[PDB]
Amino acid sequence: MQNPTQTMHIYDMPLRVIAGLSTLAKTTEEDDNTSTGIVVSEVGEPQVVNHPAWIDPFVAYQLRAPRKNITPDFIFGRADIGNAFSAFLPRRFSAPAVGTRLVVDPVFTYQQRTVLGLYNYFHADFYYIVHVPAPLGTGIYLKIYAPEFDTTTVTRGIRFKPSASPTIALSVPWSNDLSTVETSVGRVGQSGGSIVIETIEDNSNETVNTPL
Amino acid sequence: SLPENAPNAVSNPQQFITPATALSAEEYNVHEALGETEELELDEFPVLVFKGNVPVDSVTSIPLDLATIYDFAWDGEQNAISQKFQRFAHLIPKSAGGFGPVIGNYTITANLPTGVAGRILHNCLPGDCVDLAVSRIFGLKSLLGVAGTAVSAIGGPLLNGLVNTAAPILSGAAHAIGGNVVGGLADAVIDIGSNLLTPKEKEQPSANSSAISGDIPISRFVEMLKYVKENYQDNPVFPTLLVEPQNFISNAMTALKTIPIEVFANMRNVKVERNLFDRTVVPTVKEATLADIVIPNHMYGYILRDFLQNKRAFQSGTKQNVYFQQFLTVLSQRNIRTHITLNDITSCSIDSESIANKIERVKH
Amino acid sequence: SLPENAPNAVSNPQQFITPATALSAEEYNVHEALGETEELELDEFPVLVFKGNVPVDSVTSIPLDLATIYDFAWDGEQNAISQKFQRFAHLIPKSAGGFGPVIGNYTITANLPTGVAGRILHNCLPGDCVDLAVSRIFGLKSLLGVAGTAVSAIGGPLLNGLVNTAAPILSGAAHAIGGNVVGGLADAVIDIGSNLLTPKEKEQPSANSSAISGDIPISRFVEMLKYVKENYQDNPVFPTLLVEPQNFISNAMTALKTIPIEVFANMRNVKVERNLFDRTVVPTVKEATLADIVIPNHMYGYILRDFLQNKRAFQSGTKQNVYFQQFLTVLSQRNIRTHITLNDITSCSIDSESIANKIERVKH
Amino acid sequence: SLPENAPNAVSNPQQFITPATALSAEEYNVHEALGETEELELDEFPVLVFKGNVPVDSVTSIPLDLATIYDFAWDGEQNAISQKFQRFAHLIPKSAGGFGPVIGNYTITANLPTGVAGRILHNCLPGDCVDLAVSRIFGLKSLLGVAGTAVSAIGGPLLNGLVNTAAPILSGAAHAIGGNVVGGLADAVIDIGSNLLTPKEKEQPSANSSAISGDIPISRFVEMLKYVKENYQDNPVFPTLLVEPQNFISNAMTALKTIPIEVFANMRNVKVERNLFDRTVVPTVKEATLADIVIPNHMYGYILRDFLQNKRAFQSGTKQNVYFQQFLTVLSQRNIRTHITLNDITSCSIDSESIANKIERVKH
């Protein structure tokens, strides 16, 4: 006989985006940016993601291959937080120069930090929605992938043109050689949930206020 | 590939000298449904990992660190096994054994004339338990006392440790003068999964050559095989091959020393993921020698205990007392890092004698 | 386990050099329906009971006292066989043979180069009859004159006394370079009760290795195997292994002496009862050497008679006359105990010469 | 004849030490439907192509130029293989392998006593890629790093490199005293296409003799084998046999050097066309030695690159630095022709030391 599993309910989802973006496609049949030239994807065509913290479904590029994530449960104490107190939190960044590189580190809400603060080890998956508003004379060509070991290592990702597809969305699952890292420490050399944005070209006008 | 055969409950004594390592494989924590099999022709070259002379009646360590390994049968910078660690981030073992997930096999071979005769003890411990490796190196324990040890008698009149290839040409060498090419091709195309004899290596047996081989396990907590080289000094993953030549007398009934062997290896049991481009921090294959051994911080009291429960390590003038005075000296040093090396317990200085080495160590 | 095969009436000369020990087992007095079988993985480690050099053309005693036995392949205090005597009071043999109830097998092995060649006579007498043991040690009788003696020719071009293990991993070493692992696993999982070849040790035969082995009988009056160490000096139970290397010439046609062998043993044929906790009187394994031999009080006239019916023990300058003058001296000593030791008949002083040693003995 | 067996996808490690050369033959560019098979009895004599001593731990080149080849088992002017090149203009290979179209097999044999023991690495590269031949000769690379290499252990207790013929008489030697003629005739008349044992070479195995053999490929661009001797110095066709004896210790555990072997060859896999009469320019078999090697003009930078990616060729006092200073000197000479010889890179003079040899070469 096992000690019983108890459930708590959260009721109506703080910081939920209930009016989404119109440039982000809901189904795969209404998305053909890979076909002509707008998105050059090395990780496939985007799959549909349903998440509670965003009102409408959206297609996302799988930066890593989706898996099952073994969760070892032999020590005392286990919890499934599981999209509770979960939100899409925005931040602004300027686009880097052609040589440099931009690493976006993941964030999470205050109420997720409290409840997860009752435990020692965790793992999670991550989602990203990138939006570049492109006014008129925009000729930016960007590149997004997931970092692996150090500063120069490049993996398979997506390249896209924000003038014709302004919003892109991504799916970053948990990939690590250890399940359940320590929350405040982590493994050295881990990927985590970071993504990497890199500028390929700048074919814009002189009138566009660059570093967009 | 590389299957998981179920043994009986009791091991038959005519084949095994130790009990079985387990009655089932130990495939928890390994994420087998994760990669993608990638069979390129470069994987079918073996790696000459060790070559040279090896002392008789002393366990010899071969640190089998496949990420940074050197090939002595090839002069280039990379080889068949280490280039697999250059190209990818994640290596995933296909199947497992009684120790851990297993990624390859080794093969010990030795071409000896008939006038010498001895035997070989060999075992390959995962490195999750390096204490059992290091206790055997220092002469504190023998290889016959841990599960998985095999005994092979190279002499000889014996056809045991020998390599016969019979070149992979499509002709099969069907016009050969005065004899048959045994097991090459145009005899049988025996599968890698099956384990059969061709039909011609059944009456030959000079070309059959009963091999001296084991497997290469890793460790039973990692999910995949991402190599960082800082984390594997704290929690080691790669195994260690332990070889011990026992008797080895000559025709003058004189005990030999320092026989020549050489060890081959392959890694044909892995899946790959996360192909990497223009990276800077690489697994840095060390030119022309080897890796060494890393003893992490949480393994000190396990090495310390095994000297203390050994009556021979206390009496002076023996080989075990030399290592034990070298072990107590390194613990009294200053370590900015969290691990020591087996080479630090070989190239160290000396004091007098045992007890005062321990009283100064309980204060540091 | 360890069955009781019924032989024919007449032994075939191409397999046996002596008659059969019996045509049926001798399972009276042993209480086989008494214990409970207890198969732990520690039982599957063999014990290196003897290791070293052994003189040629002289019977060498190996006292096979399993309660107090030492392992030379392990540095610890206890081993696989003697810890079984620590934990329990009663050990019960499963089955029996022509001598007595039998509890295990031994294995003699020797790695020799091709330039020497001899033969080995071996037999293991129960110790209920220690006279037949001691008469063979002193050169008074040969091993060919008692039932149960086998002859194995270690040379050689011969693949006889050799150990090949092929490690018990679940992988089977299916990726081995240049040869097949013979009889390991992923060939066949041959049962401990059955006696078969795998399929790969049928054409190999370097890895098949026709063994030099016998069995370990105890004694035909005890009901179980409760060890006291005072009672077994008066009525001995444990057997004695007798080994004799005969010819052993070199390539220069020169007779050798003192060849190296080593003996393995296991006890996998017993049942247990009466598990014991925090005991004080233990069976006291003697560190680093052996047991010796105990000759009880009622065995003196049997040793005495066999010197008297030997024409070589009376003439001076021979090896048998040295032991016989050492035997008559110990009988004229003062024994507070009721038994003598074989070491007392080796490290004793000397007198002059034979007849006066006997006239002083009939008065004491 | 000489078939094209299809292997499996993954090579089994118990038979092969390298991956397979290809999974299909490479029969493009060869015009197999062109000649006419011509089986005369002179084709069934093998040719002793090489005979003599060969140094240990150094790759030895045997230039296998069949148009101008000498037979050391025959004193005449022509032999079985070179007369085929006298009589006809066009020789057409029947079948192919992973390297190229194949025209024959070789056989390495060596009669050794039991007191020495080593192993043999052998491979036969087509000569379309002579860089891989020459890099192995100079010690820059090993034979284990190229596909098609076999390993055979001649010792021994081993019956490997040996020739047993059992004379082709119609009697079968049915009245032979004290033993059976094994595999001669009146046992079985085993076909040249089939690959079986007779019935008597299944229990003999002294007369079975697991051979050390490979095949003789040519080159993958020619349509037939018209020999001109000016065109084959610019685009070489004939292969090169690479032999390497590795360990070879004696009974005194002393490393040998310079073992004796001998190599047989046959060419029984060709078709003929364009029979020639009273010709003047013949393929000129060189008396009593050999051919040498031709390194054409477009192969220089490939030999140059492999010295540069070798850390041992730069340090002085080694064998590779001797060849590399001899290689840079010949490139600074005056060549009226468009090729150099391996003998020019052996019998050349010396300068000082490496860097100034290259600065003077970039100007010439």
Residue numbers in the entry:
A (entry chain C): 1 to 212
B (entry chain A), C (entry chain A), D (entry chain A): 1 to 364
Sentences from the paper on this structure:
We determined a 2.7 Å resolution Nora virus structure using electron cryo-microscopy and single particle image analysis. The models of capsid proteins VP4A, VP4B and VP4C were built de novo to generate an atomic model of Nora virus constrained by the density from the reconstruction. Major domains of all the three subunits are β-sheet jelly rolls. We were unambiguously able to trace the C-α backbone for VP4A (residues 1–249 out of 264), for VP4B (2–242 out of 251) and for VP4C (1–364 out of 416). The disordered C-termini regions are presumably exposed on the capsid surface, as the last visible residues contribute to the striking protrusions that circle the pentamers composed of both the VP4B and the VP4C C-termini. However, the most prominent capsid surface features are the 60 mainly α-helical protrusions that are situated at the interface between VP4C contributing most of the residues and VP4B contributing one α-helix. Annulus formation is a primary requirement for intra-pentamer stability in those capsids. It is fulfilled in Nora virus by extensive interaction of VP4B and VP4C N-termini around the five-fold but at a much greater distance from the five-fold axis of symmetry. However, unlike HPeVs, there is a crossover of the VP4A N-terminus (residues 1–13) with a symmetry-equivalent N-terminus of another VP4A from the neighbouring pentamer at the two-fold axis. The symmetry-related, positively-charged histidines (residue number 9) of the two VP4A N-termini on the two-fold axis closely interact with the ssRNA genome.
Nora virus is a positive-sense, single-stranded RNA virus infecting different Drosophila species including Drosophila melanogaster and Drosophila simulans. Nora virus ORF4, situated at the 3′-terminal end of the genome, encodes a 931 amino acid-long polyprotein. The translated polyprotein is cleaved at two positions (264 aa and 515 aa) post-translationally by a virus-encoded protease to form the virion’s mature structural proteins VP4A (29 kDa), VP4B (28 kDa) and VP4C (48 kDa). The Nora virus capsid asymmetric unit is built from three subunits, a single copy each of VP4A, VP4B and VP4C.
